[PDB]
Amino acid sequence: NFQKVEKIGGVVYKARNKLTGEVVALKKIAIREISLLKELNHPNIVKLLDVIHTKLYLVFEFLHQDLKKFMDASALTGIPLPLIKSYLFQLLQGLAFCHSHRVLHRDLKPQNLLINTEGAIKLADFGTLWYRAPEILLGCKYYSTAVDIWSLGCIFAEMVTRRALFPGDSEIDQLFRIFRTLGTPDEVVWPGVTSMPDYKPSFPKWARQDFSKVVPPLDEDGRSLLSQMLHYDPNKRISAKAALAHPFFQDVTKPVPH
Ligand SMILES: O=C(O)[C@H]1CSC(c2ccc3cccc(O)c3n2)=N1
Ligand SMILES: O=C(O)[C@H]1CSC(c2ccc3cccc(O)c3n2)=N1
Numbered sequence: 001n002f003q004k005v006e007k008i009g010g011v012v013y014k015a016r017n018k019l020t021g022e023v024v025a026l027k028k029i030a031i032r033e034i035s036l037l038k039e040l041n042h043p044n045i046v047k048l049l050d051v052i053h054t055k056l057y058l059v060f061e062f063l064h065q066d067l068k069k070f071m072d073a074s075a076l077t078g079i080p081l082p083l084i085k086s087y088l089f090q091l092l093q094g095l096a097f098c099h100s101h102r103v104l105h106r107d108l109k110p111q112n113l114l115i116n117t118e119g120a121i122k123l124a125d126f127g128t129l130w131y132r133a134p135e136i137l138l139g140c141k142y143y144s145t146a147v148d149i150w151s152l153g154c155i156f157a158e159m160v161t162r163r164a165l166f167p168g169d170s171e172i173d174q175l176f177r178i179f180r181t182l183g184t185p186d187e188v189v190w191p192g193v194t195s196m197p198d199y200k201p202s203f204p205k206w207a208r209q210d211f212s213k214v215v216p217p218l219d220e221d222g223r224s225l226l227s228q229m230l231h232y233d234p235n236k237r238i239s240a241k242a243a244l245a246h247p248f249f250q251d252v253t254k255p256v257p258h
Contacts (some may be wrong), residue, residue, distance in 0.1 A: 002026055002059075009111065009125075014062060018107055024049065026059040034058075036103060037126060046092030046124040060124070060154035064117055067155075070257070075162050083255045084159045085248065087113075087121045091152055094123045099145040106130075106143075108151035110158070119254045129174040130167050131155065134185070135173045135234055139197030144215035146234035149243070153229030157215045160222070165214070176204070182230065190232040221248040238254030 002024070005014040010029040017024055019034035025046075038048045050059035067087070071079065079087075089192025091113065098105065105112075106127035114122045133150035135143050157165040166181070181183070184205045187195045193199060215226060225248045239247075 017059075019051075023062050025062045027058040027060065029056040029058070035088075040097075040101065040103070041214075042094055042097045043120065044090045044122050045098065045192060046122045055115065063114035063122060065115060066111050067113040067115060067121065067159075068123075070115060071110060071159065071162070077096075078162055079159055079256070082253055083257055084156075085120075085252050086119060086254050087115075087159070088152070088156055089244070089249050089252045090121050090241045090254075091123065091155075092243050095145075095148050095152065096244060098123070098126075099148070099240055103150075104145060105148045108148055108155065110155060113155070115257065117256075119256050130164050130168075131173060132174060133234070134175065134178055135196070136169055137178075138193070138199050145233055145239070146237040149229050150238065151236050153226055154223075156222075156226055156229065160215050160218050179203065180206045181209050181214060182232065185232040193232070219248075221246070221250075224248070 001019065002015045002017055004026070005016060005023075006207070008014050008025065010027050012025055012027045015024055015026040016022070028225060034048075034051055037049060042045070046063065047061040048058060049061060052059065083204045095105070104127065105123060107125065108123070109128060109131045110124070112125040114124050116122075129137075130153045131151040133143065133147040136147060154165045166174060168177050173174065183189075184203055187194055194201070211223065216225070218226070225238070225243065225246045228246075231237045
């Protein structure tokens with residue numbers, strides 16, 4: 001039925017549908033979540049074409065490559081700001097759509113963001129440590145859409161600087177890397193943080209970095225938006241919908257990537 005072409009990322013393969021000649025991404029691995037997922041159409045969400053239960057196989061549209069590869073390829077010169085802005089804007093549209101339908105992504109990272117030759121970018125693999133929100137790291141079981149905004153913020157910073165923002169090697173290292181940059185959170189900035197399941201009063205108390213240093217040479221509009229995406233308190237973190245109205249996107253366009 002499907003011929004595997006190569007492994008590209010459960011497990012995901014490039015494959016040919018012999019019944020249609022279509023080239024697809026085939027993921028080899030509750031039904032309600034998938035239903036909701038399947039019914040969604042948006043230009044910035046990878047389309048789920050078919051679900052085959054026999055092991056569960058999810059058949060997705062196939063896209064050119066992922067943003068990780070593009071960023072590695074662009075590491076020498078960087079991604080031009082207009083393209084960064086376009087990608088961020090598009091990802092926020094996708095998230096705004098998902099979130100309005102009560103769908104969380106929860107594992108956003110460059111490897112899960114797929115691009116095409118025409119300037120589009122799409123969200124894929126709906127649910128490393130590097131893009132995990134602090135509330136998840138502190139043991140929150142009942143987290144919100146805000147976890148996706150944190151992750152996208154980390155990705156935004158990485159596109160700009162050509163370095164991962166918080167490349168932890170363990171959950172505690174991840175948390176402490178966050179704390180060393182943004183300051184150790186307290187009840188003032190994050191009411192309720194000290195009652196979180198894995199919060200320990202013995203966490204070292206670091207001061208916040210002046211931030212100027214975190215994503216140079218991003219302009220103040222960009223820094224403003226990023227800071228709103230990285231608020232500790234998930235309830236203060238900007239929503240995708242509001243982020244779309246941020247002045248950073250006043251001059252947004254849709255360039256064609258190299
Ligand atoms: O994990 C997933 O849900 C699936 C959605 S499609 C996808 C995927 C994952 C990696 C890919 C790499 C190159 C080109 C692609 O189309 C890729 N597609 N992963
Ligand atoms: O979550 C936020 O929006 C930011 C607002 S500033 C802030 C913060 C969080 C923790 C801090 C710890 C020591 C010194 C500081 O200035 C700190 N600042 N968190």
